[PDB]
Structures are given as structure tokens and as C-alpha cells.
From Swiss-Prot, chains A, B:
GO cellular component: cytosol
Compartments, as annotated in UniProt: Cytoplasm
Purpose: Catalyzes the reductive methylation of 2'-deoxyuridine-5'-monophosphate (dUMP) to 2'-deoxythymidine-5'-monophosphate (dTMP) while utilizing 5,10-methylenetetrahydrofolate (mTHF) as the methyl donor and reductant in the reaction, yielding dihydrofolate (DHF) as a by-product. This enzymatic reaction provides an intracellular de novo source of dTMP, an essential precursor for DNA biosynthesis. This protein also binds to its mRNA thus repressing its own translation.
SUBUNIT field: Homodimer.
Protein name: Thymidylate synthase
Name of the gene: thyA
Length: 264, 264
């Protein structure tokens, strides 16, 4: 992908050497925004092979309000394992804030039903927002929300979404995180009878880890191949109703996978 | 100012006609990011005269955790009047979330002391964030947070800040809102013994109201005059200690004020 490749180049050319949490040096820039028009094709990186299945399964887990790893395990999805305790609990992380944000008076606010209410009945709102940055619960979560905050916008029957990501690893994390939300703009739009507009990605500490240098050089040498097309095979009766098999990606010919290790 | 003038031009050239809350048509774009390097001068618009005093006073009110209009009144600051009830209460809006975010278990989290702790003892954090988007309290606030969310970053002794603004009126609102946070990056940096870096502004529904068309045309015809220089005259003992008179702006020669009305 072109916008992504432009970002990769930029953190190599402009980033400051900054450390991780007593770890790995990174090259970091701060403050980057990229726009993906979803009508031009699905934003899945063609410059290295990326697979959709852990992406799809992790999102359906978010939408269920699940905070325990069990569902992912049933499906041999392992990405959150690193974070979960013995009984598979992750603390009040994303699914929890999204579907049952706790109030000081005992309520649990379902932010994505709110968002669907707002998109059908008041599409012109400037407050169509869901947040996972619940300050009162940050101390109990495995990790603090990386994609912390996002907002929808409707103009001319096109639903667009801006995401605020506080910290992103451009090589390993970012391809995954761009396709997860593009999937979500497409579930949302089908459920609201709106067309897809844009996915705007804004980031904060946007970084390359230094032991991913050869891999980014490899990748920056590859020409972006055309973008695939996502097809949702069923219109479920609601957004908490999609199932893994409702999704197909057609026309994707990526260049090979590049693996990249992590310090520990 | 150049970045601002570039934005004004862009919403006139690219915005979609979108309505307000049963009101005024606006021209709206969605998703804009601009960078101001604070070492190049203070970002106070020179293309129309803007005064600093309501800006300074409203920020000190935010920092006090005040939600009642009294302090502003004592000082003949009137900007929030439109919103306050009879007894001057505004609901749990900004000062309240900033200094006493309520947890579900009875605590009140002081987010800006947190932020100062993080900036002196762990300057490399990717979690140096304060949020005013307290979902549990949105129903009790006069209006929902417009500047909802912001994040600090330290690299090479330069403190930078990215702001997420969900809705901005580019003519009347935006000059005010850019100088308020630039002031805050400068209080923060003096208290942390860091230099100022960048102020990154990200916006969501960024709009011009249509009955501000002649005024924006007037203004887009004016050449940006050089940027002033803010001088803080005292180093208070903390951030809750600045006083109105600690601030002077030197070298500001703006073009005249342009007034712009609002529908009701």
C-alpha cells in the first residue's frame, strides 16, 4: 500500500531515536494522518502477505463485549495470549468499554448501539464517537487502549471514520489495525444502509523498531499491487450478528510474508 | 496564519454542504491535521485581531477544576454564559474531567497531575494523555467536549502535544482553540524543564458556517503577518499556580478584527 509505504519511508527519514519501555530503540515521529477511500478497494497491504482471519475474529470478539481469551482460543486465534492471565482475563480492555462502559452510578453504556442509534436517527451529529480510554479503569486493563478513540461522520450517504491511535508499530501493528477498522466501517455502513466513505487514521507515537530495519528495506523495494475487494456475503440482522464466514476478500495477490521478531 | 489560511481555503474548496443541529448550513470537511512548531513563534492569528485575555482566563479556570462561571464573571469573561444555567453551572464539563474524573469506585482522577508525573519521571511514555470524553457523564454536561482528547510526547527535550477536536468552526472557534493549547504546551514545558516542540491539531468535522462567507473572503485576502512571541514573566511553583499577569505577547501586529454573527 502507497500511503503506508509513504509512512514507512517517513519514519526512517525523519524519526528520532527513542526507546521503548526499557527495551528496544525505535525511530519515532509524532502526529501522522493518512486517508483511505474505501470505495477505492479494501486497505489490506499487498507489499507483504497479511491474512484476514485473526483480524476478523478479534473484531467479532470486541463486538461481543468479551474480555476473555476463550473465544479466540476456540478458533485457534492466539494474538492476545501474550497479555492474558492464567484464566484468560485481560482486564476491562476494548470489548468491555465498547459494549459496557461503567458509569459512576451503576450503569453500563453500550457505545456501539449508541453509535448505530445516532447514525440512523441523527446522521449529521458531530458527537458520533466511541471511546475505550476509560481513565478510571486503566489501572485494571492488561494494556492501555492503543486505538483509543474513534468518530464517525456521514456526508452524502458515505460513512467515514477517523481513528486516533496513541502508539503504533508501523511494521507489525499498523497493517492489522488498518484492516480491522476498515472491516468495521463496512459492517457499520451495511447496517445503516450507507455507502463507505473514508477511513482516516491519525496516530500519535508512530514508530519503527530498529530490529525491523532489514524487513522494512525489503518491503520498501516492493511495488504496491492493486487493492482487493471485500465482499460481505450476508446482511445479518444487526452488528452483533456477523459471523466469520460472512466475509470474503477477492483479488488479493500480495507479495510474500515478511516476518519480524520482537525483543522480550 | 499560513496553516489556518490553507485550512480556510480547503473547506471552501472541498467541503460538503452539511447542516447544523436544526440550523445553519455549514461547508464541512472531515479529518484535517496541521502542525505548528512552537519554537517558530506563538500561533496567534495575525490575519484578524484576536485577543488573548479570555483565552488565558478560560484556561486557568479549566486548571482549577472549575465548572461554574463565577471566576470568569469576576473578570468580566463572558464566553460561557451562553451555556450556563441560572446558578452558573455547566455540568461536568472540562475542568471537572481534567482534575477530578470520577471512577465507578468513588475516586476522582486528577489527569493533569498524572500527566506532569509522567512527563518528569517517564518522559518516553506513549500513554501521556488527558481525556474529557467521560461517556458516563456526557448526559449531565452543558455540551459534549469539543476538544475531547489530547496527548503529549517528549523527544529531544521538546514537549509536543496533539489535540483531537471532534467539531470545529474554523472562523470563530479555531483561532481561540489553537492559542489556548499552545499556552498549555508552554505552561507544561516550563514546569517540566522541557523546551516547546510542536502542537499538532487534528480535527474531525471541521467546518465554515455559510453566513461567514464574506468574512472568510475578507480574511483570505490578507497576508499573514509574522508570529508573536509569548513570554512568561514568572516560573510559578506549579501549573495550578499561574496567574493572568504572568503572560505577555510581544510583536503582534494583527490586521483588524472581523466580526461574525451566529444564527440562534
Amino acid at each position: 500500500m502507497k500511503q503506508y509505504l509513504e509512512l514507512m519511508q517517513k519514519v526512517l527519514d525523519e524519526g528520532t531515536q527513542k526507546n521503548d519501555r526499557t527495551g528496544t530503540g525505535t525511530l519515532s515521529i509524532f502526529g501522522h494522518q493518512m486517508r483511505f477511500n474505501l470505495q477505492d478497494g479494501f486497505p489490506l497491504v499487498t507489499t507483504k502477505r497479511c491474512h484476514l482471519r485473526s483480524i476478523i475474529h478479534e473484531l467479532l470478539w470486541f463486538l461481543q463485549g468479551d474480555t476473555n481469551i476463550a473465544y479466540l482460543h476456540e478458533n485457534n486465534v492466539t494474538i492476545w495470549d501474550e497479555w492474558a492471565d492464567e484464566n484468560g482475563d485481560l482486564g476491562p480492555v476494548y470489548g468491555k468499554q465498547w459494549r459496557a462502559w461503567p458509569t459512576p452510578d451503576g450503569r453500563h453504556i453500550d457505545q456501539i448501539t449508541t453509535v448505530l442509534n445516532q447514525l440512523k436517527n441523527d446522521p449529521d451529529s458531530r458527537r458520533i464517537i466511541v471511546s475505550a480510554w476509560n481513565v478510571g479503569e486503566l489501572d485494571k486493563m492488561a494494556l492501555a487502549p492503543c486505538h483509543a478513540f474513534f468518530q464517525f461522520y456521514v456526508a452524502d450517504g458515505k460513512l467515514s471514520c477517523q481513528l486516533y491511535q496513541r502508539s503504533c508499530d508501523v511494521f507489525l501493528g499498523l497493517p492489522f489495525n488498518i484492516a480491522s477498522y476498515a472491516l468495521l466501517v463496512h459492517m457499520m455502513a451495511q447496517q445503516c444502509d450507507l455507502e463507505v466513505g473514508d477511513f482516516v487514521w491519525t496516530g500519535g507515537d508512530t514508530h519503527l523498531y530498529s530490529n525491523h530495519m532489514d524487513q522494512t528495506h525489503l518491503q520498501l523495494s516492493r511495488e504496491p499491487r492493486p487493492l482487493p475487494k471485500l465482499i460481505i456475503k450476508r446482511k445479518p440482522e444487526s452488528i452483533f450478528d456477523y459471523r466469520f464466514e460472512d466475509f470474503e476478500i477477492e483479488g488479493y495477490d500480495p507479495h510474500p510474508g515478511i516476518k519480524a521478531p520482537v525483543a522480550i
